[PDB]
């Protein structure tokens, strides 16, 4: 049985408009390792970097997708994940409070 991903989208530092920050999508707990994780700026895929494939003690995998960004008032940010456990892509929106 495949295991589904947990997904968290968040900034490195607390978000302040106009201050350069870092945008993170942390995907964990999945199996098998084939997966597509995209950070989105208003729906368009960002050219984000992805960490090396690692896994935890239960053998489930984890990955960090991350890129530079500068928050402001109107730009919407989200992370989109495709996996064999998901019939439709899972989408998580970033917000400053999580």
């Amino acid at each position: 049985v495949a295991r589904p991903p947990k997904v968290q989208v968040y900034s490195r530092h607390p978000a302040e408009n106009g201050k350069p920050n870092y945008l993170n999508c942390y995907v964990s707990g999945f199996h098998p390792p084939q997966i597509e994780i995209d950070l989105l700026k208003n729906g368009e895929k960002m050219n984000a970097e992805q960490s090396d494939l690692s896994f935890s003690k239960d053998w489930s995998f984890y990955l960090l997708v991350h890129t530079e960004f500068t928050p402001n008032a109107v730009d919407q940010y989200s992370c989109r994940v495709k996996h064999v456990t998901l019939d439709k892509p899972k989408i998580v929106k970033w917000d400053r409070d999580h």
Partner: protein, 275 residues
């Protein structure tokens, strides 16, 4: 703390390309320091933490030699495992191993481990005496016999008690300014609207190392862990970690709750409220 050196190997069969891909990452404690990707052209062991770059060319050459060898060992493994389980070449299958050494307070090996998994399930594991194996099913007993015949158990035990702990101790000195510095979480509490008769308090712990931390809410000193949301600890991207704990309180009752943080790089356990 009890420091560790660990490696994580993922081998994946790739039917369409008719090959496989081997990926290895090495950690010291919560810090990734090396990687190897069989897909990279002229694949080599590669630094992933600044302090490992002071290793001279002989270290990089010989780590590269092993990973290239073990990469092809795991490619054969994937085909054998296909045979053991009456599987076609249609699908992709995953073959993982992890192994490492924990360092006790006496500089000695606290606990050594080596285990393997196939398609997410435990396959075979080295027992805690580092002398015997435990196999999970029929297929793994085939592997257990082969490794008993060839005396693999004490090759693992020797590595685990010798070179594993020895390199761990070099790494710990090489990177003592970061690896052996306990960085404390920068904490604060925020308030947000919720639902009917509901107001959420969220207690953040940001940029800490190592990963282990304890976050709890308390009302008059009694734990509120039944009604609290605790996110999985997550990486910051700069080598540190992040976590928060949130709960729903009745509007105007915020000051009756406190957030409690213990982290190894904190003098006292910290108590903070909503300000």
């Amino acid at each position: 703390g009890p420091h560790s050196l660990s490696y994580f190997y993922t081998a994946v069969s790739r039917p369409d390309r008719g090959d496989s891909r081997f990926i290895a990452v090495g950690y010291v404690d919560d810090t990734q320091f090396v990687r190897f990707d069989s897909d990279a052209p002229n694949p080599r062991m590669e630094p992933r933490a600044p302090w490992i770059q002071q290793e001279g060319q002989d270290y990089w050459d010989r780590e590269t030699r092993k990973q290239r060898d073990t990469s092809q060992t795991y490619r054969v493994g994937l085909k054998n495992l296909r045979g053991y389980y009456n599987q076609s070449e249609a699908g992709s299958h995953t073959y993982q191993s992890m192994y490492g050494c924990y360092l006790g307070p006496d500089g000695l090996l606290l606990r050594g481990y080596r285990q393997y998994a196939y398609d997410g399930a435990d396959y075979i594991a080295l027992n805690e005496d580092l002398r015997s194996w435990t196999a999970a099913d029929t297929a793994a007993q085939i592997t257990k016999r082969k490794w008993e015949t060839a005396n693999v158990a004490e090759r693992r035990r020797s590595y685990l008690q010798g070179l594993c702990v020895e390199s761990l101790r070099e790494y710990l000195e090489m990177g003592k300014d970061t690896l052996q510095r306990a960085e404390p979480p920068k904490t604060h509490v925020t308030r947000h609207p919720s639902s009917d008769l509901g107001v959420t308090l969220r207690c953040w712990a940001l940029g800490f190392y190592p990963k282990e931390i304890s976050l709890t809410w308390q009302r008059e000193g009694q734990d509120q862990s039944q009604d609290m949301e605790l996110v999985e600890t997550r990486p910051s991207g700069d080598g540190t970690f992040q976590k928060w704990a949130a709960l729903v309180v009745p509007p105007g009752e915020e000051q009756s709750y406190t957030c409690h943080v213990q982290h190894e790089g904190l003098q006292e356990p910290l108590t903070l409220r909503w300000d």
